[PDB]
Design a binder for this molecule. Structure first.
Ligand SMILES: [K+]
Ligand SMILES: [Mg+2]
Ligand SMILES: [Mg+2]
Ligand SMILES: [Mg+2]
Ligand SMILES: [Mg+2]
Ligand SMILES: [Mg+2]
Ligand SMILES: [Mg+2]
Ligand SMILES: [Mg+2]
Ligand SMILES: [Mg+2]
Ligand SMILES: [Mg+2]
Ligand SMILES: [Mg+2]
Ligand SMILES: [Mg+2]
Ligand SMILES: [Mg+2]
Ligand SMILES: [Mg+2]
Ligand SMILES: [Mg+2]
Ligand SMILES: [Mg+2]
Ligand SMILES: [Mg+2]
Ligand SMILES: [Mg+2]
Ligand SMILES: [Mg+2]
Ligand SMILES: [Mg+2]
Ligand SMILES: [Mg+2]
Ligand SMILES: [Mg+2]
Ligand SMILES: [Mg+2]
Ligand SMILES: [Mg+2]
Ligand SMILES: [Mg+2]
Ligand SMILES: [Mg+2]
Ligand SMILES: [Mg+2]
Ligand SMILES: [Mg+2]
Ligand SMILES: [Mg+2]
Ligand SMILES: [Mg+2]
Ligand SMILES: [Mg+2]
Ligand SMILES: [Mg+2]
Ligand SMILES: [Mg+2]
Ligand SMILES: [Mg+2]
Ligand SMILES: [Mg+2]
Ligand SMILES: [Mg+2]
Ligand SMILES: [Mg+2]
Ligand SMILES: [Mg+2]
Ligand SMILES: [Mg+2]
Ligand SMILES: [Mg+2]
Ligand SMILES: [Mg+2]
Ligand SMILES: [Mg+2]
Ligand SMILES: [Mg+2]
Ligand SMILES: [Mg+2]
Ligand SMILES: [Mg+2]
Ligand SMILES: [Mg+2]
Ligand SMILES: [Mg+2]
Ligand SMILES: [Mg+2]
Ligand SMILES: [Mg+2]
Ligand SMILES: [Mg+2]
Ligand SMILES: [Mg+2]
Ligand SMILES: [Mg+2]
Ligand SMILES: [Mg+2]
Ligand SMILES: [Mg+2]
Ligand SMILES: [Mg+2]
Ligand SMILES: [Mg+2]
Ligand SMILES: [Mg+2]
Ligand SMILES: [Mg+2]
Ligand SMILES: [Mg+2]
Ligand SMILES: [Mg+2]
Ligand SMILES: [Mg+2]
Ligand SMILES: [Mg+2]
Ligand SMILES: [Mg+2]
Ligand SMILES: [Mg+2]
Ligand SMILES: [Mg+2]
Ligand SMILES: [Mg+2]
Ligand SMILES: [Mg+2]
Ligand SMILES: [Mg+2]
Ligand SMILES: [Mg+2]
Ligand SMILES: [Mg+2]
Ligand SMILES: [Mg+2]
Ligand SMILES: [Mg+2]
Ligand SMILES: [Mg+2]
Ligand SMILES: [Mg+2]
Ligand SMILES: [Mg+2]
Ligand SMILES: [Mg+2]
Ligand SMILES: [Mg+2]
Ligand SMILES: [Mg+2]
Ligand SMILES: [Mg+2]
Ligand SMILES: [Mg+2]
Ligand SMILES: [Mg+2]
Ligand SMILES: [Mg+2]
Ligand SMILES: [Mg+2]
Ligand SMILES: [Mg+2]
Ligand SMILES: [Mg+2]
Ligand SMILES: [Mg+2]
Ligand SMILES: [Mg+2]
Ligand SMILES: [Mg+2]
Ligand SMILES: [Mg+2]
Ligand SMILES: [Mg+2]
Ligand SMILES: [Mg+2]
Ligand SMILES: [Mg+2]
Ligand SMILES: [Mg+2]
Ligand SMILES: [Mg+2]
Ligand SMILES: [Mg+2]
Ligand SMILES: [Mg+2]
Ligand SMILES: [Mg+2]
Ligand SMILES: [Mg+2]
Ligand SMILES: [Mg+2]
Ligand SMILES: [Mg+2]
Ligand SMILES: [Mg+2]
Ligand SMILES: [Mg+2]
Ligand SMILES: [Mg+2]
Ligand SMILES: [Mg+2]
Ligand SMILES: [Mg+2]
Ligand SMILES: [Mg+2]
Ligand SMILES: [Mg+2]
Ligand SMILES: [Mg+2]
Ligand SMILES: [Mg+2]
Ligand SMILES: [Mg+2]
Ligand SMILES: [Mg+2]
Ligand SMILES: [Mg+2]
Ligand SMILES: [Mg+2]
Ligand SMILES: [Mg+2]
Ligand SMILES: [Mg+2]
Ligand SMILES: [Mg+2]
Ligand SMILES: [Mg+2]
Ligand SMILES: [Mg+2]
Ligand SMILES: [Mg+2]
Ligand SMILES: [Mg+2]
Ligand SMILES: [Mg+2]
Ligand SMILES: [Mg+2]
Ligand SMILES: [Mg+2]
Ligand SMILES: [Mg+2]
Ligand SMILES: [Mg+2]
Ligand SMILES: [Mg+2]
Ligand SMILES: [Mg+2]
Ligand SMILES: [Mg+2]
Ligand SMILES: [Mg+2]
Ligand SMILES: [Mg+2]
Ligand SMILES: [Mg+2]
Ligand SMILES: [Mg+2]
Ligand SMILES: [Mg+2]
Ligand SMILES: [Mg+2]
Ligand SMILES: [Mg+2]
Ligand SMILES: [Mg+2]
Ligand SMILES: [Mg+2]
Ligand SMILES: [Mg+2]
Ligand SMILES: [Mg+2]
Ligand SMILES: [Mg+2]
Ligand SMILES: [Mg+2]
Ligand SMILES: [Mg+2]
Ligand SMILES: [Mg+2]
Ligand SMILES: [Mg+2]
Ligand SMILES: [Mg+2]
Ligand SMILES: [Mg+2]
Ligand SMILES: [Mg+2]
Ligand SMILES: [Mg+2]
Ligand SMILES: [Mg+2]
Ligand SMILES: [Mg+2]
Ligand SMILES: [Mg+2]
Ligand SMILES: [Mg+2]
Ligand SMILES: [Mg+2]
Ligand SMILES: [Mg+2]
Ligand SMILES: [Mg+2]
Ligand SMILES: [Mg+2]
Ligand SMILES: [Mg+2]
Ligand SMILES: [Mg+2]
Ligand SMILES: [Mg+2]
Ligand SMILES: [Mg+2]
Ligand SMILES: [Mg+2]
Ligand SMILES: [Mg+2]
Ligand SMILES: [Mg+2]
Ligand SMILES: [Mg+2]
Ligand SMILES: [Mg+2]
Ligand SMILES: [Mg+2]
Ligand SMILES: [Mg+2]
Ligand SMILES: [Mg+2]
Ligand SMILES: [Mg+2]
Ligand SMILES: [Mg+2]
Ligand SMILES: [Mg+2]
Ligand SMILES: [Mg+2]
Ligand SMILES: [Mg+2]
Ligand SMILES: [Mg+2]
Ligand SMILES: [Mg+2]
Ligand SMILES: [Mg+2]
Ligand SMILES: [Mg+2]
Ligand SMILES: [Mg+2]
Ligand SMILES: [Mg+2]
Ligand SMILES: [Mg+2]
Ligand SMILES: [Mg+2]
Ligand SMILES: [Mg+2]
Ligand SMILES: [Mg+2]
Ligand SMILES: [Mg+2]
Ligand SMILES: [Mg+2]
Ligand SMILES: [Mg+2]
Ligand SMILES: [Mg+2]
Ligand SMILES: [Mg+2]
Ligand SMILES: [Mg+2]
Ligand SMILES: [Mg+2]
Ligand SMILES: [Mg+2]
Ligand SMILES: [Mg+2]
Ligand SMILES: [Mg+2]
Ligand SMILES: [Mg+2]
Ligand SMILES: [Mg+2]
Ligand SMILES: [Mg+2]
Ligand SMILES: [Mg+2]
Ligand SMILES: [Mg+2]
Ligand SMILES: [Mg+2]
Ligand SMILES: [Mg+2]
Ligand SMILES: [Mg+2]
Ligand SMILES: [Mg+2]
Ligand SMILES: [Mg+2]
Ligand SMILES: [Mg+2]
Ligand SMILES: [Mg+2]
Ligand SMILES: [Mg+2]
Ligand SMILES: [Mg+2]
Ligand SMILES: [Mg+2]
Ligand SMILES: [Mg+2]
Ligand SMILES: [Mg+2]
Ligand SMILES: [Mg+2]
Ligand SMILES: [Mg+2]
Ligand SMILES: [Mg+2]
Ligand SMILES: [Mg+2]
Ligand SMILES: [Mg+2]
Ligand SMILES: [Mg+2]
Ligand SMILES: [Mg+2]
Ligand SMILES: [Mg+2]
Ligand SMILES: [Mg+2]
Ligand SMILES: [Mg+2]
Ligand SMILES: [Mg+2]
Ligand SMILES: [Mg+2]
Ligand SMILES: [Mg+2]
Ligand SMILES: [Mg+2]
Ligand SMILES: [Mg+2]
Ligand SMILES: [Mg+2]
Ligand SMILES: [Mg+2]
Ligand SMILES: [Mg+2]
Ligand SMILES: [Mg+2]
Ligand SMILES: [Mg+2]
Ligand SMILES: [Mg+2]
Ligand SMILES: [Mg+2]
Ligand SMILES: [Mg+2]
Ligand SMILES: [Mg+2]
Ligand SMILES: [Mg+2]
Ligand SMILES: [Mg+2]
Ligand SMILES: [Mg+2]
Ligand SMILES: [Mg+2]
Ligand SMILES: [Mg+2]
Ligand SMILES: [Mg+2]
Ligand SMILES: [Mg+2]
Ligand SMILES: [Mg+2]
Ligand SMILES: [Mg+2]
Ligand SMILES: [Mg+2]
Ligand SMILES: [Mg+2]
Ligand SMILES: [Mg+2]
Ligand SMILES: [Mg+2]
Ligand SMILES: [Mg+2]
Ligand SMILES: [Mg+2]
Ligand SMILES: [Mg+2]
Ligand SMILES: [Mg+2]
Ligand SMILES: [Mg+2]
Ligand SMILES: [Mg+2]
Ligand SMILES: [Mg+2]
Ligand SMILES: [Mg+2]
Ligand SMILES: [Mg+2]
Ligand SMILES: [Mg+2]
Ligand SMILES: [Mg+2]
Ligand SMILES: [Mg+2]
Ligand SMILES: [Mg+2]
Ligand SMILES: [Mg+2]
Lengths: 48, 275, 7
RNA sequence: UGGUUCGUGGAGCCAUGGGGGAAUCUGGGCGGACCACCGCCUAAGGCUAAGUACUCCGGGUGACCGAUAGCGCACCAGUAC
RNA sequence: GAGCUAGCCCUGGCCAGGGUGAAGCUGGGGUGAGACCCAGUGGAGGCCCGAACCGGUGGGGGAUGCAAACCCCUCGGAUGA
RNA sequence: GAAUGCCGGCAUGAGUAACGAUAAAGAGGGUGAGAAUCCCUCUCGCCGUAAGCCCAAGGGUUCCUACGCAAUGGUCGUCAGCGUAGGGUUAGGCGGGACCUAAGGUGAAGCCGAAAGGCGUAGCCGAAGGGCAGCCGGUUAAUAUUCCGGCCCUUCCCGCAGGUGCGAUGGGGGGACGCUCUAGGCUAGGGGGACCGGAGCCAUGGACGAGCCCGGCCAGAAGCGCAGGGUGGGAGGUAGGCAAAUCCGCCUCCCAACAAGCUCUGCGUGGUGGGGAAGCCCGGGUGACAACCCCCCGAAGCCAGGGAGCCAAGAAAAGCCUCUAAGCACAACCUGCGGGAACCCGUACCGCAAACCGACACAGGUGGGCGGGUGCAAGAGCACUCAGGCGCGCGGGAGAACCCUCGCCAAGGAACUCUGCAAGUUGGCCCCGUAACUUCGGGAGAAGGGGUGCUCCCUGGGGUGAUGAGCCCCGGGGAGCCGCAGUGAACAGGCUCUGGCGACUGUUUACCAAAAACACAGCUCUCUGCGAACUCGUAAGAGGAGGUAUAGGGAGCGACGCUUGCCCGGUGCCGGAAGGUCAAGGGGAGGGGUGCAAGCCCCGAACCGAAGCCCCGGUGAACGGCGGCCGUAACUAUAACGGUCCUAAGGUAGCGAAAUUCCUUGUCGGGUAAGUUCCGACCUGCACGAAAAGCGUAACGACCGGAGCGCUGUCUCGGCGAGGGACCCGGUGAAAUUGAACUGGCCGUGAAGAUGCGGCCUACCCGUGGCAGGACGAAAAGACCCCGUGGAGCUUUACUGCAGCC
RNA sequence: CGAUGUCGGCUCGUCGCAUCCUGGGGCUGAAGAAGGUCCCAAGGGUUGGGCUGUUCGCCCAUUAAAGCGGCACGCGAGCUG
RNA sequence: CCGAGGGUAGGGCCCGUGACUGGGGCGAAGUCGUAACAAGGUAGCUGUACCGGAAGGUGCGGCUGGAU
RNA sequence: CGCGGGGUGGAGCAGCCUGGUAGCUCGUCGGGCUCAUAACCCGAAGGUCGUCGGUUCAAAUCCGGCCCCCGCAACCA
């Protein structure tokens, strides 16, 4: 049957992407925390 | 004269359709239509703020001349009468001797090829617009401005009309379509005659889908819901209201008046409505 | 399913 | 209404959202309602080191751990997944 | 978090084939004129049968599954909300 | 040493289940250390509106080639989507960007909010919509509308020539639009040929034939031909298109009009360039100077912005054209030609799947296009096949029980069972024929029947063509033939009678309920005069609605028919300028503290003083509610009638043992041999009843009840047969569970149901196929139940607050 | 109560005897035939249907008879539901 | 080929019969009330409508076959 | 022996709460009006309060047992 993950590159970049995060106080906290934790990736991978 | 159908489907038993026999032109003036942004009853937050809306036929909005004092003195010819999917009345296309083309609400008995005109000096004649102070007492009038220059606000639905009952200083006394008696400023414009398509109220939609064509999604009774949803929700089996009949939001809905008491227009409402 | 409904 | 030990208390003091609304020392505030007396202090402008706090960083030292412990990671770990 | 699911908005796409035969129109009849009747034409409909497509009615299987909802037979809708 | 403890290691179950669609395999040759599993050949089988082909998502080197086989692959492995290395994606014309706008997003101006932030016109962004110039072939191991070949085309720059009032983010035109049905002419695609081209073949009884088999085209600029779309010309006026306008709009006038003219597509033709089969021989080469023609069928595609009808009334913006403003007319634009210039990103491969979403090479899920042929009425259905692609990554045997899926069955035919559940039956087409009832549509495919193949002969109409032949499409009549049987296989209703419920088509508990539930047209009540009411938001702002009482919100009812009674005392809502009560505030009788005093300070009665409440009325498709006891008629029985008590008023019509009836299988009637169900009645209705509507109702229903016919393996009652498993051999090899075990029966005992205690009995040791009585078997710290001064959802005239409103 | 699945049916039995039938008896208000009642006796047998989920029961047609009870109201790691 | 008739299926007409149900006629001395006949004590009758244990009442319109 | 309500002239209802006082309508009987009946008018009679027992100076009244008669309830399985 149809499952929950239906990959869509435009959707991924526009929802979780760097510029979405930067536009919102909550998004900037996400990046701030992920930098402080040392994440190799701040934002999900999507090829565009 | 509404049209009927032989019972060749269960729904055609009851469906009636407007006869459209007054319509002379069946596509709209391209320079006077604009896109009608459908809303689904959603506001600018995205929230439904008027339940059960959406899904209706696509529509172009026709720009209607609700002022008419725009062009005092300039006779126009009635060029065509057309269908308008954004209102109950029909609309009439005027070709002004100016060259300018405008739409107005089509009053009852207006004919292609006649001439209408707006202003203090306009003949007391169906389709002419005048300031209320110059229309003689007793005249049946429509497309009435509610304050001078703010645009025709009253009696615009198919079949409606307002009757001039008297004068009092700068103000005239109208009997509105509701039966309310109200003071309206003498300098307010109105158009002689009643709105046309008076048979509109006799249409029998006939089937559920026909409501869906109009953008009306199904209405669900509060008594069909659960307590989290509605005052009338819940209960084992069916249930009477069990409390004063209420809206989804809890206010009473059988008689509870809701006009604001301290409203300034109260000084101008002579008699509340009827029936 | 679930349990035997001993009710 | 807040603050203070003060939760309306005899409730002052400091602060102030609303209304009313002064005076320039013979002016004004305070000493826990209020009044007298006796004293203290000068509101509605601003600035000001040091002693104080913290440990990303560096070093020193442990009746601290010693690879299931000690940081989540002694190791290509905020990785693989 | 609405890449699942619910509703709405914008823009596109899809619906084999067959059956029934509404209004209207033409002609004929009818009458003072009408209503109306017959035939032809016409091609309406949350119309009929049935694939795609959308479903999930009954039963059987599956039940550490092929599958954390599937498989087989059967069955509903299929120009419309 | 225990915490269903934590982390890890290793056991048991067990050589057990399983190895992932029952589309299927066999053999020969090759390679190699090794071969059912890799390569080649022949045979066989499966898909073929796909299980073939092409796009788009998504994936991201999985592509090609060489060398590999530890692991991955459910077995094997020499193979591979695996490991190592090298190679591979070529564009002015395809797609996206240097173009346009849509929802929406963002947002100079502006608005709002403690902060963060929320809005917001223009503008900007935003596509699978608008716009815009490339077709056919060849070539690589791997890319090709991209490289190459042939023939075309677009934009930008610069020059030359001719022409012109040139010039725009501004004005206007256009772009520009629905649903259904559909004309003419074409193309795609396909069928046929006695004509053209071709390596060959003659078999096994016959055929050297007007025989079999294969093929018989593709692209193409200007020109021309066919078919279409678009499009009036001229003059005068002019105040409107937010300046101007010679444009457009309006008025008048002349001429032209089912035309024509001009213009724009599509198809055909067209210089030229291509392609080219079977077969044969080793992807190639030959065939081959291959031929490339005639007839038919024919789109849902094309001409297209075509036509008609209908109501639910069907994007924007740019490109483009035209008008003029600043400016400029040494410019500038238009037309023609010439040279030059033309950037960025994608392009491999998979793509209904072993490469995407499902932890797996997972029977699931995934949008668009092509999807051949024959027959079956048609069709994308069904059967078999083309092209093409596969036999599903464990096999070999055996032929037990039992399971699955499937076939048949004597006599009976629902006797099965909660239930005809399941499975039979029926089944397409043509014709004959068809009932109650009905809202006149229907009910209806009602029911029930007859026909269906093949051969010969006669004949009617249409399409193409020419009116004929030929091809093709619809028929009619007559005479025959064969079989058990002619929709001969495959696909393809069982029917009727009668209730309940719901009018109907729809909708729902993704994943135990599809329903009588929700919805639905329609009915009624009620709010709302527009800066509407109502809704979201602190606000701004939005929705409502660019709507205006024939409109919009809320509530209930639920097509339609006939109807919808009595009660306003309580609650609600509506009305009521009196009266009562009522807060802050006003007022200040009279008191109190302090001071020598002027004063300062505090308390404070009468009185004025809103909404709300009380009080007076109204109101039922507002919440709701609609009695009791006793007596009475000339047989009896029963009471039309009376008495009395109570209430705000005592349930009307209609219906009733009912989706409601406890006593109950009420009573009687029907149906049956027999009927706790069903149907029709009666009425002492435990406990119907009129918009939480009452009683009916044609049609409708994968709804629920009852009956009958048809037919059946449901059953009496079971039998046999098929295949996939189960079993055996080779390969690979889990699981929950498990205190340890050397783990029998009875009768007792025991915490009350004992393999484990007592007494007796019985019993050599160890497995394999089976069956499920026990191990109070496994699974899940019982959902029921209770308990906890545990939790959460929900309600209200519980308490207390807050929004909101007054 | 860190679960002893709970009615009825179907299937499969097995046991008790307070015996329904069949066999053996006594007494009889036992003429015969047929019964009544009690004693002994558990070897075997103890039907098919209509109704209801039903157990039970009533009904139909038979029968030698259409027994009553236990086995976790025997039997859901056997099925149904 | 036709064909008595037999069979299957579906209609139409008529007769009889049915729990129960509707009103009708009749029946020496039942119970309720008093509608009509006099102005019958509300003139009556009337078509229709609605209501009520029962006659009846009331509305609308009509008749005189209505009295003084 | 689950929980309520009730028993008083002939019928139907007060009086019980708060102990001393039996009351209302109809009915029944005598008279009147009428030709007669009904209606109507004038008079009158009839209840030791279901029962037994207790408290009290005194019980329909208050308390306990019994009799009778209506109403409610009987849930989780
Ligand atoms: K319970
Ligand atoms: Mg889904
Ligand atoms: Mg998606
Ligand atoms: Mg994307
Ligand atoms: Mg995308
Ligand atoms: Mg997206
Ligand atoms: Mg976003
Ligand atoms: Mg982003
Ligand atoms: Mg911030
Ligand atoms: Mg990470
Ligand atoms: Mg890094
Ligand atoms: Mg992130
Ligand atoms: Mg109609
Ligand atoms: Mg009709
Ligand atoms: Mg009209
Ligand atoms: Mg426009
Ligand atoms: Mg809007
Ligand atoms: Mg917005
Ligand atoms: Mg709303
Ligand atoms: Mg809405
Ligand atoms: Mg209109
Ligand atoms: Mg409207
Ligand atoms: Mg006004
Ligand atoms: Mg209507
Ligand atoms: Mg609409
Ligand atoms: Mg509606
Ligand atoms: Mg509704
Ligand atoms: Mg509900
Ligand atoms: Mg509900
Ligand atoms: Mg919610
Ligand atoms: Mg709540
Ligand atoms: Mg609520
Ligand atoms: Mg409720
Ligand atoms: Mg409910
Ligand atoms: Mg209920
Ligand atoms: Mg409910
Ligand atoms: Mg209630
Ligand atoms: Mg309420
Ligand atoms: Mg309100
Ligand atoms: Mg009003
Ligand atoms: Mg404090
Ligand atoms: Mg204080
Ligand atoms: Mg001083
Ligand atoms: Mg001072
Ligand atoms: Mg101070
Ligand atoms: Mg001080
Ligand atoms: Mg001081
Ligand atoms: Mg100071
Ligand atoms: Mg140590
Ligand atoms: Mg370690
Ligand atoms: Mg560690
Ligand atoms: Mg350690
Ligand atoms: Mg570290
Ligand atoms: Mg560190
Ligand atoms: Mg660690
Ligand atoms: Mg690592
Ligand atoms: Mg989604
Ligand atoms: Mg369709
Ligand atoms: Mg026809
Ligand atoms: Mg027509
Ligand atoms: Mg349909
Ligand atoms: Mg049909
Ligand atoms: Mg589904
Ligand atoms: Mg079935
Ligand atoms: Mg499952
Ligand atoms: Mg099937
Ligand atoms: Mg269809
Ligand atoms: Mg269908
Ligand atoms: Mg639609
Ligand atoms: Mg211990
Ligand atoms: Mg464990
Ligand atoms: Mg633990
Ligand atoms: Mg552990
Ligand atoms: Mg380890
Ligand atoms: Mg472990
Ligand atoms: Mg291990
Ligand atoms: Mg071991
Ligand atoms: Mg082992
Ligand atoms: Mg075993
Ligand atoms: Mg297994
Ligand atoms: Mg398996
Ligand atoms: Mg299969
Ligand atoms: Mg199979
Ligand atoms: Mg197959
Ligand atoms: Mg082989
Ligand atoms: Mg091999
Ligand atoms: Mg090998
Ligand atoms: Mg194989
Ligand atoms: Mg091979
Ligand atoms: Mg061979
Ligand atoms: Mg991947
Ligand atoms: Mg390997
Ligand atoms: Mg290997
Ligand atoms: Mg190696
Ligand atoms: Mg492996
Ligand atoms: Mg595998
Ligand atoms: Mg090798
Ligand atoms: Mg490559
Ligand atoms: Mg190129
Ligand atoms: Mg550039
Ligand atoms: Mg743009
Ligand atoms: Mg704020
Ligand atoms: Mg964007
Ligand atoms: Mg685009
Ligand atoms: Mg468009
Ligand atoms: Mg080209
Ligand atoms: Mg090509
Ligand atoms: Mg020019
Ligand atoms: Mg247009
Ligand atoms: Mg438009
Ligand atoms: Mg072509
Ligand atoms: Mg063909
Ligand atoms: Mg060749
Ligand atoms: Mg050659
Ligand atoms: Mg199409
Ligand atoms: Mg087109
Ligand atoms: Mg058209
Ligand atoms: Mg329409
Ligand atoms: Mg726009
Ligand atoms: Mg100039
Ligand atoms: Mg010059
Ligand atoms: Mg560039
Ligand atoms: Mg490529
Ligand atoms: Mg698929
Ligand atoms: Mg693959
Ligand atoms: Mg997942
Ligand atoms: Mg596989
Ligand atoms: Mg072909
Ligand atoms: Mg067919
Ligand atoms: Mg296979
Ligand atoms: Mg397969
Ligand atoms: Mg074997
Ligand atoms: Mg046979
Ligand atoms: Mg048989
Ligand atoms: Mg039979
Ligand atoms: Mg039979
Ligand atoms: Mg049966
Ligand atoms: Mg059932
Ligand atoms: Mg069959
Ligand atoms: Mg068939
Ligand atoms: Mg009929
Ligand atoms: Mg019938
Ligand atoms: Mg019938
Ligand atoms: Mg009927
Ligand atoms: Mg009919
Ligand atoms: Mg038939
Ligand atoms: Mg028929
Ligand atoms: Mg025949
Ligand atoms: Mg034959
Ligand atoms: Mg024969
Ligand atoms: Mg069928
Ligand atoms: Mg329904
Ligand atoms: Mg329903
Ligand atoms: Mg109904
Ligand atoms: Mg109905
Ligand atoms: Mg439908
Ligand atoms: Mg469900
Ligand atoms: Mg569920
Ligand atoms: Mg679920
Ligand atoms: Mg289900
Ligand atoms: Mg359900
Ligand atoms: Mg259904
Ligand atoms: Mg529902
Ligand atoms: Mg309905
Ligand atoms: Mg209404
Ligand atoms: Mg709000
Ligand atoms: Mg608006
Ligand atoms: Mg209705
Ligand atoms: Mg409903
Ligand atoms: Mg009717
Ligand atoms: Mg009534
Ligand atoms: Mg009242
Ligand atoms: Mg009331
Ligand atoms: Mg009231
Ligand atoms: Mg007041
Ligand atoms: Mg009440
Ligand atoms: Mg109530
Ligand atoms: Mg009854
Ligand atoms: Mg009933
Ligand atoms: Mg009931
Ligand atoms: Mg009963
Ligand atoms: Mg019962
Ligand atoms: Mg019975
Ligand atoms: Mg009977
Ligand atoms: Mg019945
Ligand atoms: Mg009775
Ligand atoms: Mg109700
Ligand atoms: Mg109800
Ligand atoms: Mg009914
Ligand atoms: Mg019905
Ligand atoms: Mg019906
Ligand atoms: Mg249905
Ligand atoms: Mg249904
Ligand atoms: Mg049945
Ligand atoms: Mg039956
Ligand atoms: Mg069988
Ligand atoms: Mg077999
Ligand atoms: Mg062996
Ligand atoms: Mg092995
Ligand atoms: Mg292995
Ligand atoms: Mg041991
Ligand atoms: Mg041992
Ligand atoms: Mg043992
Ligand atoms: Mg043993
Ligand atoms: Mg015991
Ligand atoms: Mg024992
Ligand atoms: Mg033992
Ligand atoms: Mg021992
Ligand atoms: Mg011992
Ligand atoms: Mg022992
Ligand atoms: Mg022993
Ligand atoms: Mg023994
Ligand atoms: Mg074995
Ligand atoms: Mg075994
Ligand atoms: Mg066992
Ligand atoms: Mg068992
Ligand atoms: Mg056991
Ligand atoms: Mg246990
Ligand atoms: Mg057990
Ligand atoms: Mg479980
Ligand atoms: Mg726990
Ligand atoms: Mg527990
Ligand atoms: Mg639990
Ligand atoms: Mg308990
Ligand atoms: Mg407590
Ligand atoms: Mg406690
Ligand atoms: Mg608690
Ligand atoms: Mg328990
Ligand atoms: Mg346990
Ligand atoms: Mg357990
Ligand atoms: Mg059985
Ligand atoms: Mg004898
Ligand atoms: Mg004896
Ligand atoms: Mg025996
Ligand atoms: Mg029974
Ligand atoms: Mg019984
Ligand atoms: Mg006998
Ligand atoms: Mg027993
Ligand atoms: Mg028992
Ligand atoms: Mg029992
Ligand atoms: Mg029991
Ligand atoms: Mg059992
Ligand atoms: Mg079970
Ligand atoms: Mg059971
Ligand atoms: Mg068990
Ligand atoms: Mg067990
Ligand atoms: Mg059940
Ligand atoms: Mg015969
Ligand atoms: Mg008498
Ligand atoms: Mg009278
Ligand atoms: Mg009389
Ligand atoms: Mg009279
Ligand atoms: Mg009288
Ligand atoms: Mg009356
Ligand atoms: Mg009495
Ligand atoms: Mg009392
Ligand atoms: Mg007293
Ligand atoms: Mg008395
Ligand atoms: Mg007397
Ligand atoms: Mg008398
Ligand atoms: Mg006394």
């Amino acid at each position: 049957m149809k499952r929950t993950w239906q990959p869509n590159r435009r959707k991924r970049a526009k929802t979780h992407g760097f510029r979405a995060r930067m536009r919102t106080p909550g998004g900037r906290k996400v990046l701030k925390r992920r930098r402080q934790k040392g994440r190799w990736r701040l934002t999900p991978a999507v090829r565009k | 004269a509404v049209k009927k159908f032989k019972p060749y489907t269960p729904s055609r038993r009851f469906m009636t359709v407007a006869d459209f026999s007054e319509i002379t032109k069946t596509e709209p003036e391209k320079s006077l239509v604009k896109p009608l942004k459908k809303t689904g009853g959603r506001n600018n937050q995205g929230r439904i703020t008027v339940r059960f809306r959406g899904g209706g036929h696509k529509r172009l909005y026709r720009i209607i001349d609700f002022k008419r004092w725009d062009k005092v003195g300039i006779p126009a010819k009635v060029a065509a009468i057309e269908y308008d999917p954004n209102r109950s009345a029909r609309i009439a296309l005027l070709h002004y001797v100016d060259g300018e083309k405008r739409y107005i609400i089509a009053p009852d008995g207006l004919q292609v090829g006649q001439q209408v005109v707006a202003g203090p000096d306009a003949p007391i004649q169906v389709g002419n617009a005048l300031p209320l102070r110059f229309i003689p007492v007793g005249t049946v009038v429509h497309a009435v401005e509610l304050e001078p220059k703010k645009g025709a606000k009253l009696a615009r639905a198919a079949g409606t009309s307002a009757q001039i009952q008297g004068r009092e200083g700068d103000y005239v006394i109208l009997r509105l379509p509701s039966g309310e008696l109200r003071k309206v400023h003498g300098e307010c414009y109105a158009t002689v005659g009643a709105v046309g398509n008076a048979d509109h109220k006799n249409i029998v939609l006939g089937k559920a889908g026909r409501s869906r064509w109009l953008g009306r999604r199904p209405h669900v009774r509060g008594a069909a819901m659960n307590p989290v949803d509605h005052p009338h929700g819940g209960g084992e089996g069916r249930a009477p209201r069990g409390r004063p009949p209420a809206s989804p939001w809890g206010w009473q809905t059988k008689g509870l008046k809701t006009r604001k008491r301290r409203k300034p227009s109260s000084r101008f409402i002579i008699a509340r409505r009827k029936k | 399913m679930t349990h035997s409904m001993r009710c």
